[PDB]
Amino acid sequence: FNPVGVAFKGNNGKYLSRIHRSGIDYTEFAKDNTD
């Protein structure tokens, strides 16, 4: 039993820092591909 606890409570990710813009010049989301 634990109704008070859902999921959002108690959850940590990591050091969010790697890509910004200088190290990337693509457009996968901006422009989709055909097939």
Side-chain angles (χ1 to χ4, degrees), residues 17-35:
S17 266
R18 221 290 216 285
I19 189 165
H20 232 115
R21 55 111 68 178
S22 305
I24 179 148
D25 283 318
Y26 273 88
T27 38
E28 184 98 311
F29 195 94
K31 250 231 271 141
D32 224 85
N33 265 25
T34 189
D35 51 18

Side-chain angles (χ1 to χ4, degrees), residues 5-21:
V6 183
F8 256 113
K9 62 107 75 208
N11 260 93
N12 60 295
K14 304 180 110 154
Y15 263 83
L16 263 111
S17 266
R18 221 290 216 285
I19 189 165
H20 232 115
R21 55 111 68 178

